[PDB]
Amino acid sequence: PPRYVIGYALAPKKQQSFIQPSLVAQAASRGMDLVPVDASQPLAEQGPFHLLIHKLYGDDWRAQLVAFAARHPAVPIVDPPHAIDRLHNRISMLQVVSELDHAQDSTFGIPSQVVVYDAAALADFGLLAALRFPLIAKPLVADGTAKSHKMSLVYHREGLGKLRPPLVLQEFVNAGGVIFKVYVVGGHVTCVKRRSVVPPAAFINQIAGGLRRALGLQLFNFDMIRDVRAGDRYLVIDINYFPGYAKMPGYETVLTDFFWEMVHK
Amino acid sequence: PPRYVIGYALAPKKQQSFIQPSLVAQAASRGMDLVPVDASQPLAEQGPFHLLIHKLYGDDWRAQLVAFAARHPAVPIVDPPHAIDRLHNRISMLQVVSELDHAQDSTFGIPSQVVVYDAAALADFGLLAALRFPLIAKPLVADGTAKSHKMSLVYHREGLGKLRPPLVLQEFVNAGGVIFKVYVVGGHVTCVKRRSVVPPAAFINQIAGGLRRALGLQLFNFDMIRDVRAGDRYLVIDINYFPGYAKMPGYETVLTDFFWEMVHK
Ligand SMILES: [Cl-]
Ligand SMILES: [Cl-]
CATH class of the missing domain: 3.40.50.11370 (Rossmann fold)
Structure with missing residues (x-):
């Protein structure tokens, strides 16, 4: 054979x-x-x-x-390098998430974001002083190779000024303090908890499906939070391409099954 | 010949x-x-x-x-379609502007931006109520073919809610009400006023030069405002690829001279 x-x-x-x-x-x-x-x-x-x-x-x-x-x-x-370029700037990543909203009992949003390009704005930009803490602060442009390119949490405005722009901030007060990291391989989904009431599996699959069509990507994960104001609503906060599958156990079987699916495409 | x-x-x-x-x-x-x-x-x-x-x-x-x-x-x-993809999402466009800050008496920034992805956030996102009016409101993803993909001005929060997300907003209060539209062809620059004290020509050229290296683009323009708080500081607010050269007169000579430069590259 x-x-x-x-x-x-x-x-x-x-x-x-x-x-x-x-x-x-x-x-x-x-x-x-x-x-x-x-x-x-x-x-x-x-x-x-x-x-x-x-x-x-x-x-x-x-x-x-x-x-x-x-x-x-x-x-x-x-994945094709077109599809991957969409996730490199942390504002573009959520643009692609916004494409499918057709997906019941639960709802999914993107959180609004603020982009601060220069130290001059970090000090002087009035809008920042109307921000609630804590904040998710990510640097604007990401990859997976450059170290500084993973999310971090800011409690004081002092701590924010000690950060290196450009950067993107979102509010983290409606999250209840919980984050679910969903891992996707083609049409397969795997999901994990993390501290810094678990979404229906049919909801995660709808979103995973949506993200996959929209993203044009076989290998990504996404972080979602519950919007704890309602008890039923979830936000997609990060999308990273080709994440650390080697973390979820039995990844070998998922990835080999996916490779087989891909070489009979 | x-x-x-x-x-x-x-x-x-x-x-x-x-x-x-x-x-x-x-x-x-x-x-x-x-x-x-x-x-x-x-x-x-x-x-x-x-x-x-x-x-x-x-x-x-x-x-x-x-x-x-x-x-x-x-x-x-x-231009090469890689270089052009950077300007398509109105947050990515300013990321590329932020790359060269080495360019004297005058200074150039990018204005901080807010991205609102869903109608749910437009209503509910607390930070929006700490915004000064007017606002430049652009839709997030642009081109030059789709109509809705040029900037607009918002005075009331009522008017903002009547807009179609996703969208990007910047503050427009520090601008003094003036916009200069700089047109660039390779290493050539042409500049125009517009109402909705003219930057030194050596400053515009420094920026035009910077944008060109950073953008990797031969054919673009950029809008800058004076930050009227200082009388000497300027912000790059938009970058559009392959703009309406047919507007500036003698464009034919600029573009033909550029074509000649390009076919002896
Ligand atoms: Cl891995
Ligand atoms: Cl034209």
């Missing part, structure tokens, strides 16, 4: 966490060879691939991925 | 305004043939081009532009 190459272009820290012996074995056992993409050697040179999965951020990388995609159209890229 | 094809892929309304007999003649007179890209026929089929200029918005168009760019690397695209 035939064998399926899965190319993988990942940062070393991500290789260590994601490409684990248990993944490599299960995949190999089902006829799927996870093959590392030489970073020191153009993609178009590198061996034939039945699927390309990557999490690299460059105009350089982007360029090779586009060559390849026109060179090899039938070969799925997970 | 040799002749230079300039392909042009533009919406009909833009063709009418931009591709004028005076442009076609001057360009032809200098050996440069402006040739319309058949919208009903893939780019890769269409005749050889020494330069491609376009202002079309599609995943469809984007796809053909990328084929071409890998197919024909030495052929300049004005």
Whole structure:
């Protein structure tokens, strides 16, 4: 029978966490060879691939991925670098979340955001003094490789001024102090609690489904909070591409099942 | 001597305004043939081009532009669809403006912004009631083809609620009521007043230069206001790709000189 190459272009820290012996074995056992993409050697040179999965951020990388995609159209890229660019600026990410609102008993919003570009505005922008604390403060442009590119919590206006713009802030007072981190692989969903009353599974699936159509992304997760004013309403606060699946257990089986689905696309 | 094809892929309304007999003649007179890209026929089929200029918005168009760019690397695209995607969401546009702050007597900022994604937030988001009027209210995602995608002015909170989210708001009280619309072609700058004390020409050029490096765009304009609190400080409030050059007079000469510069790149 035939064998399926899965190319993988990942940062070393991500290789260590994601490409684990248990993944490599299960995949190999089902006829799927996870093959590392030489970073020191153009993609178009590198061996034939039945699927390309990557999490690299460059105009350089982007360029090779586009060559390849026109060179090899039938070969799925997970995910296509167009789709991934939408999540890089923390305002654009929520724009794509806003696209599907058709999805019952529960409701989903995006929280309103404030973007502060310069230290001059952080001090002087009047609107900031009408903000409730705490605040989720994220830097505006993200990736997964640059350290500073994960969310943080601000209680005093003093603490806010000690931050490095550009940044995006949202209010965190309506959240009740709880965050659910939903993980998505194609049409599969996995969900986890976290402290800093669990949404109906059919609601999470509706949203996960929505985000997937809208995002055009196979591999992402999303954070939602309950709006505790109503007891039934939920907000999507973050969307990160290709998160730490290696955290949820049995990820190997989910990801191998997904790879199989992808190489019979 | 040799002749230079300039392909042009533009919406009909833009063709009418931009591709004028005076442009076609001057360009032809200098050996440069402006040739319309058949919208009903893939780019890769269409005749050889020494330069491609376009202002079309599609995943469809984007796809053909990328084929071409890998197919024909030495052929300049004005502008490359990566560079153009940065300006499409009105928060991402200011992120790219924030990149160069090295550019004396005068200073340039980005104004802080508020993004409201859902009607639910427009009504309920507390921070909005701490906003000064008037407001510049733009819809979040823009282009140049969809009508609703140009800025507007809000005086009452009533008027704000009658708007269609998603949208981005900035404060307009520090502006003194004046807007300068700077037009840029490669390394050339042209500037115009507008009512709704003129920045030093060396300041506008510094910014225009900065925006151009940062934006990676040959064809854009930017709106700046004076921050009237100081009498010397200026804010970049909008950046639109491939604006209405056909408005500034002698645009034909600027654009033909630029085309010549581009086909000797
Ligand atoms: Cl992982
Ligand atoms: Cl025009």
